[PDB]
Amino acid sequence: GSDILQELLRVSEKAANIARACRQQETLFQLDFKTLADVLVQEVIKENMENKFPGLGKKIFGEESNELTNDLGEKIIMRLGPTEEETVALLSKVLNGNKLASEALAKVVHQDVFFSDPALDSVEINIPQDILGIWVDPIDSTYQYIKGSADITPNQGIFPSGLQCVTVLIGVYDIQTGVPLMGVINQPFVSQDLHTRRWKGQCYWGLSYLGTNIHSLLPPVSVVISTSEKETIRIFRAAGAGYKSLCVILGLADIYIFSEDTTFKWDSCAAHAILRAMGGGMVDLKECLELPQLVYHVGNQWANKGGLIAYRSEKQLETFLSRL
Ligand SMILES: [Gd]
Ligand SMILES: [Gd]
Ligand SMILES: [Gd]
Ligand SMILES: [Gd]
């Protein structure tokens, strides 16, 4: 699934473009638009993968429905393309005939982006298409996205809030076993040029298939824990489900622990796969308080009931579990 992973990187950077535009571009910034933006990103990934790999389109699941409601109360089925003009005519039904906003989105949705890791072009791993399911969280950390803080100082490499906490989560899992095989995390807002206002992004991929474990090149640099801003259970507050998982991937945090039932398969799947590829993973917190990995094939519905612990090292985990 190296050719599938390489294609999931492209659409994630295409998703990042849509995430950046709706903050950067000023027509869209003024403007429920977030739910629209989520479905639009979710439908871009769904169709592009269907296009390049026929049969995967019906195996791509996500946080949002493909159906939205406008101010008139009409229910619209969000199907993009094939031409740019049809997407304008579809979005103008949802945004109350707002042509400036409809033309703006459609231009980014139909924008050919060429994002490729040459490291992944070298590797030739094949995974049967028939055993693959995909979980998608289009733009994670809704609150931090809409507020849009670009001026927050990180506490020891970890941003407590701000646009850095926003991530595009695309996970791929085995349908039969439920084990996450591949995962892509895209930070659309990492570094801003103060003068030009332009945001530079960063993507992270990982593969774990039948003992073959490869991941993206990670930048250099007792225990360092990262909890959510609402967590009421050296500890760090950090916003965004995806970002807190990325902190464990980047080594900024040793453990990410979430107690509540308000995380879902699409929040964790992408990170879990990348963590698996570095010899880590995610366990059920409640089952550990009585190593059971999170599954992504069976429901309960698609919430991680009993919380989760995200770990990079299995030794770091055992130490943390000994204290708790
Ligand atoms: Gd290939
Ligand atoms: Gd959403
Ligand atoms: Gd389609
Ligand atoms: Gd989320």
Author numbering: 1 to 31, 48 to 237, 262 to 273, 284 to 340, 349 to 358, 366 to 389
Q: From the publication, what sentences describe this entry?
A:
Inositol polyphosphate 1-phosphatase (INPP1) is a prototype member of metal-dependent/lithium-inhibited phosphomonoesterase protein family defined by a conserved three-dimensional core structure. Enzymes within this family function in distinct pathways including inositide signaling, gluconeogenesis, and sulfur assimilation. INPP1 catalyzes the metal-dependent hydrolysis of the phosphomonoester bond from the 1 position phosphate of Ins(1,4)P2 or Ins(1,3,4)P3 to yield inositol 4-phosphate and inositol 3,4-bisphosphate, respectively. Conserved secondary structural elements comprise juxtaposed metal binding pockets and define a shared sequence pattern of D54…E79E80…D153PID156S157T158…D317 as shown for INPP1.
We tested the effects of substrate addition by co-crystallization of INPP1 with a 10X molar excess of Ins(1,3,4)P3 substrate and 2 mM inhibitory Gd3+. Although we could not confidently model the substrate in the resultant structure, metal sites GD1 and GD3 became equivalently occupied. Difference Fourier analysis showed densities peaks of 20.5σ and 20.0σ in metal sites GD1 and GD3, respectively, giving a relative occupancy of 1.0. Consistent with the Fo-Fc differences, anomalous differences peaks of 15.4σ and 14.0σ were calculated, giving a relative occupancy 1.1. Whereas in the absence of substrate, the gadolinium in metal site GD3 were found at half occupancy and had B-factors greater than twice the average, and in the presence of substrate, the gadolinium in site metal site GD3 was well ordered, refined to full occupancy and had B-factors well below the global average. Co-crystallization with Gd3+ but in the presence of substrate (I(1,3,4)P3) resulted in equivalent occupancies of metal sites GD1 and GD3 consistent with the hypothesis that substrate binding alters affinity at metal site GD3 by contributing an additional coordinating ligand through phosphate oxygen. The observation occupancy at a second/third site is also consistent with previous kinetic studies which demonstrated metal binding in INPP1 is cooperative with a Hill co-efficient of 1.9 which predicts if metal site 1 is predominantly bound in the absence of substrate, that an additional two metals are bound cooperatively upon substrate binding. It is noteworthy that the addition of substrate resulted in a significant change in the ratio and intensity of electron density peaks such that metal sites equivalent occupancies of sites GD1 and GD3, each having a tremendous signal exceeding 20 sigma. Anomalous signals confirm this is because of metal binding. In the Gd3+/Ins(1,3,4)P3 and Gd3+/Li+/Ins(1,3,4)P3 structures, the ion could either be a phosphate from the Ins(1,3,4)P3 substrate molecule or a sulfate from the Gd2(SO4)3 in the crystallization solutions. While we did not observe the Ins(1,3,4)P3 substrate, we hypothesize the sulfates and/or phosphates seen in the INPP1 structures represent the 1- and 4-PO4 positions that would be found with ordered substrate or reaction product.
